[PDB]
């Protein structure tokens, strides 16, 4: 049971748990049951668009990210945050997507 | 080597147009801010690959 | 993406009008040698050379930033062309 | 093992000997650019 | 040439450190070990255990208190404790409160050479008739050690807590291409560091590089036993545990030595004599 | 509960192979120390390579030699495998000469011996020569780091000399193993083993030491957080031309020029001394 995302991912860094493991993490005042990976995705979006609440609204956390969900994410981001921020989010999604894709095995 | 620096100065803020045949829609041509690189190959961003 | 592009699209009813304003303003800046700018010395766009920070040669960037400031006025039939050109040449010679 | 980090890839990966050929299409032959140059007789448009 | 090192910091919680230019490949060569060390080997403090008077286990709930034990422990995990004394390795904080009050970090009983970096940290809300009496264990350590791993209990009913020792909250590094005019394949290193404020990002980084260097330094230097004699049992045990285990030592034992032994008297002297009659 | 300085064990086989063990180390430090050294060992270790080749009556790389089986390209290819050891640390370049003929298979030994130059692989084949076949060549071997393509250095001792791709790195292979170990009370501790294969020019221990030194020197860079040309000075024209072509081009050198130096210059007299003084009055 993690107090914050930083703790969960610090635990991941030391090999205590994996990114695909279901864990209890406390995020934004609410107690969530999810993987460190999805929290990490949420942080990717959050830092990308520089708005944490809106980002939290956009993402579907209870589901694995795929073509349709990510497309919906892009569109909603375009509507809410505008061109520039959505572009930044796109670059972020690209970067982390690739980065994880290589180490995924 | 100074003329390369000069070339860096010239293209500053300017963009170029990339085109791929067949050009089916308006995104067959797009604008990009060029970043000078060694080598004879043009480097394209992944995300635009679908539109082209 | 160009900085504040959404806000720039906000200022106009048509994107093409934004493009025309930017282009024409850039022409003004080029013609008068940037000395007619509405920007402040700390607002001036910079470019990193081997020497160091220098004035940005690109007039379109200048025009877009200037437009973002709000200190520019754009529209149709604001002033006869000749009068505008001559007053500009009086305030900022060539 | 990832040569950058030193840490292994999180899963087993297929590695082996493959036969790969270098084709006749090379950038050196295909790279081309033009500022100004020769124009056509009748059309006065640039050549191909 | 000698690369430039630039530092841009915001408070004590966050820092950015740029190193450029570097030779090709050295961006990750420097970047990777520093990241590993900063998260693991940077010394810090953490709550490792908690004892609550009327709480039997971690999943229990406290009457009169809004937060459950889990949430309280979670908040205690956020507690940042700075030890002023370098030789001080452990402290027990005590807390006693009641009534309609919102408990903060300040309410902890003050300890000498112990500074609370976050006194505004919320712990638990107490209502009318609510009583909170607890003792928290603060230790010095490194890295991240789960509760199951250390399993330390000062007393019974004590709940082990996941220990986040590292004052460093996060480490990220980006390596991008850069050029020195003619060469374009040079490396630019950007280090992003998040800390809890107890240790400064620059300080943490310095400790990390110092540790790494120190680690690099390590490559420098490439007459028989009485027990068997079969004597009386009392003789065995006494003589043995009396600092001697042989007939040679028994021989060393003079009149004012053998008889001086607490166990030895006459019944023992008898058996002993018999032995000296068997061996001579 | 603080770990102490680990034992370091060294196992070497000749100059070509080495094993270096450090144990015990804290968990995860096996790759933390092991990996960066590997990267440096593969990239940054200084070595020697053939940088140039001139073969008599041979104009270019695509030429062919009468009496010799191998073509020039193949010969250069064989020369790329040549491992040359400089005994003198101050020696940065050497030109090897080779002359052979008749029905013989030319090896590395046939190279004319040079002082402070040792050929580690004398059994290396170069070219097969036939009756009436004549091979007379000079190869230039330089010291450098990394990989420098022929197009990059463009080194030519003479006109008909053929530039050769220079593979400087003496380190052939680097592997590292991390294994479990315990120090009595603490378990899951790390044992680091570094295995290094080299060409023999540099010793594995030497290579490792250089690598560690490089890493340390680079670690020093985290320490600090964050004399003009006379031609530009604007001095008199005569001053510009004279002072410049007089072997100096700066105010530092002008400062170096004592009374029996500045006034000794053929161009300089008193009219120059005036301007000079003025310059020293503007800067001080």
Swiss-Prot record, chain A:
Organism of origin: Thermus thermophilus (strain ATCC 27634 / DSM 579 / HB8)
Domain of life: Bacteria
Summary of subunit composition and partner proteins: The RNAP catalytic core consists of 2 alpha, 1 beta, 1 beta' and 1 omega subunit. When a sigma factor is associated with the core the holoenzyme is formed, which can initiate transcription.
Chain's role: DNA-dependent RNA polymerase catalyzes the transcription of DNA into RNA using the four ribonucleoside triphosphates as substrates.
Protein name: DNA-directed RNA polymerase subunit beta'
Record-stated family: Belongs to the RNA polymerase beta' chain family.
Residue window of the full protein shown: 842 to 946 of 1524
From Swiss-Prot, chain B:
Domain of life from the UniProt record: Bacteria
Subunit structure: The RNAP catalytic core consists of 2 alpha, 1 beta, 1 beta' and 1 omega subunit. When a sigma factor is associated with the core the holoenzyme is formed, which can initiate transcription.
Role according to the record: DNA-dependent RNA polymerase catalyzes the transcription of DNA into RNA using the four ribonucleoside triphosphates as substrates.
Family label: Belongs to the RNA polymerase beta' chain family.
Designated name of the protein: DNA-directed RNA polymerase subunit beta'
Organism field: Thermus thermophilus (strain ATCC 27634 / DSM 579 / HB8)
Residues of the full protein shown: 685 to 736 of 1524
Swiss-Prot record, chain C:
Keywords: DNA-directed RNA polymerase, Nucleotidyltransferase, Transcription, Transferase
SUPFAM superfamilies found in the cross-reference section: RPB6/omega subunit-like
Gene3D superfamilies associated with the record: 3.90.940.10
Record's signal peptide: none
A molecular-function term among this protein's GO annotations: DNA binding
Transmembrane segments: none
Annotated GO CC locations: DNA-directed RNA polymerase complex
Catalytic activity: RNA(n) + a ribonucleoside 5'-triphosphate = RNA(n+1) + diphosphate
Record-linked InterPro entries: DNA-dir_RNA_pol_omega, Pol_omega/Rpo6/RPB6, RPB6/omega-like_sf
Pfam families: RNA_pol_Rpb6 (PF01192)
Class of enzymatic activity (EC top level): transferase
GO biological process: DNA-templated transcription
EC number(s) stated in the UniProt entry for this protein: 2.7.7.6
Family: Belongs to the RNA polymerase subunit omega family.
Role description: Promotes RNA polymerase assembly. Latches the N- and C-terminal regions of the beta' subunit thereby facilitating its interaction with the beta and alpha subunits.
Subunit structure and binding partners: The RNAP catalytic core consists of 2 alpha, 1 beta, 1 beta' and 1 omega subunit. When a sigma factor is associated with the core the holoenzyme is formed, which can initiate transcription.
Name of the protein in question: DNA-directed RNA polymerase subunit omega
Lineage of source species: Bacteria, Thermotogati, Deinococcota, Deinococci, Thermales
Gene coding for it: rpoZ
From Swiss-Prot, chain D:
Domain of life: Bacteria
Similarity comment: family membership: Belongs to the RNA polymerase beta chain family.
Job of this protein: DNA-dependent RNA polymerase catalyzes the transcription of DNA into RNA using the four ribonucleoside triphosphates as substrates.
Assembly mode: The RNAP catalytic core consists of 2 alpha, 1 beta, 1 beta' and 1 omega subunit. When a sigma factor is associated with the core the holoenzyme is formed, which can initiate transcription.
The name this protein goes by in its record: DNA-directed RNA polymerase subunit beta
Lineage: Bacteria, Thermotogati, Deinococcota, Deinococci, Thermales
Gene giving rise to this polypeptide: rpoB
């Amino acid at each position: 049971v993690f107090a914050n995302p930083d703790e969960a991912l610090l635990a991941v860094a030391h090999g205590i748990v994996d990114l695909q493991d279901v864990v209890t993490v406390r995020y934004m005042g609410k107690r969530l049951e999810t993987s460190p990976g999805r929290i990490l995705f949420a942080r990717i979006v959050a830092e990308a668009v520089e708005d944490e609440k809106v980002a939290w609204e956009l993402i579907q956390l209870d589901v694995p990210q795929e073509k349709n969900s990510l497309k919906d994410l892009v569109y909603q981001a375009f509507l809410r945050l505008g061109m520039e921020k959505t572009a930044r989010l796109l670059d972020a999604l690209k970067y982390y997507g690739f980065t994880f894709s290589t180490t995924s095995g | 080597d100074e003329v390369w620096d000069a070339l860096e100065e010239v293209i500053h803020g300017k963009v170029v147009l990339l085109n791929r045949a067949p050009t089916l829609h308006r995104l067959g041509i797009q604008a990009f801010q060029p970043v000078l690189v060694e080598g004879q190959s043009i480097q394209l961003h992944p995300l635009v690959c679908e539109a082209f | 993406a160009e900085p504040g592009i959404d806000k720039l699209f906000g200022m106009v009813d048509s994107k093409y009008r934004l493009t025309v304003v930017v282009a024409k303003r850039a022409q003004q800046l080029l013609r008068h040698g940037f000395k007619n700018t509405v920007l402040e010395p700390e607002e001036r766009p910079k470019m990193q050379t081997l020497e160091g920070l220098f004035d940005d040669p690109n007039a379109v960037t200048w025009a877009m930033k200037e437009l973002l400031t709000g200190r520019l006025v754009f529209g149709e039939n604001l002033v006869p062309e000749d009068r505008l050109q001559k007053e500009m040449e009086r305030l900022y010679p060539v | 093992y990832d040569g950058r980090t030193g840490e292994p890839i999180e899963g087993p990966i297929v590695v082996g000997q493959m036969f790969i050929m270098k084709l006749y299409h090379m950038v050196e032959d295909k790279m081309h650019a033009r500022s100004t140059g020769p124009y056509s007789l009748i059309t006065q448009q640039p050549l191909g | 040439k000698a690369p430039v090192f630039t530092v841009r910091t915001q408070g004590r919680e966050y820092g950015e450190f740029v190193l450029e230019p570097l030779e090709r490949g050295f961006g990750v060569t420097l970047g990777n070990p520093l990241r590993r060390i900063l998260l693991s080997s940077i010394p810090g403090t953490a709550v490792t255990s908690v004892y609550i008077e009327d709480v039997l286990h971690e999943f229990s709930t406290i009457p009169g208190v809004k937060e459950d034990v889990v949430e309280i422990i979670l908040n205690l995990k956020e507690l940042v404790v700075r030890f002023l004394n370098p030789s001080l390795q452990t402290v027990t904080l005590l807390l006693k409160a009641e009534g309609p009050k919102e408990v903060k970090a300040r309410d902890f009983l003050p300890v000498a050479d112990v500074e609370i970096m976050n006194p505004d940290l919320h712990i638990a809300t107490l209502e009318e008739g609510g009583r909170l009496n607890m003792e928290v264990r603060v230790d010095r350590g490194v890295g991240y050690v789960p509760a199951e791993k250390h399993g330390i209990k000062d007393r019974i009913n004590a709940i082990p807590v996941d220990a986040v020792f590292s004052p460093v909250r996060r480490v990220a590094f980006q390596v991008e291409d850069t050029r020195l005019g003619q060469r374009t394949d040079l490396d630019k290193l950007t280090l992003r560091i998040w800390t809890d404020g107890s240790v400064t990002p620059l300080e943490a980084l310095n400790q990390a590089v110092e540790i790494l260097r120190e680690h690099l330094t390590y490559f420098s230097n490439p007459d028989l036993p009485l027990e068997e004699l079969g004597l009386s049992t009392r003789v065995l045990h006494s003589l043995k545990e009396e600092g001697i285990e042989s007939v040679r030592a028994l021989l060393a034992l003079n009149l004012k030595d053998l008889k001086n032994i607490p166990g030895i008297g006459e019944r023992s002297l008898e058996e002993i004599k018999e032995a000296l009659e068997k061996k001579g």
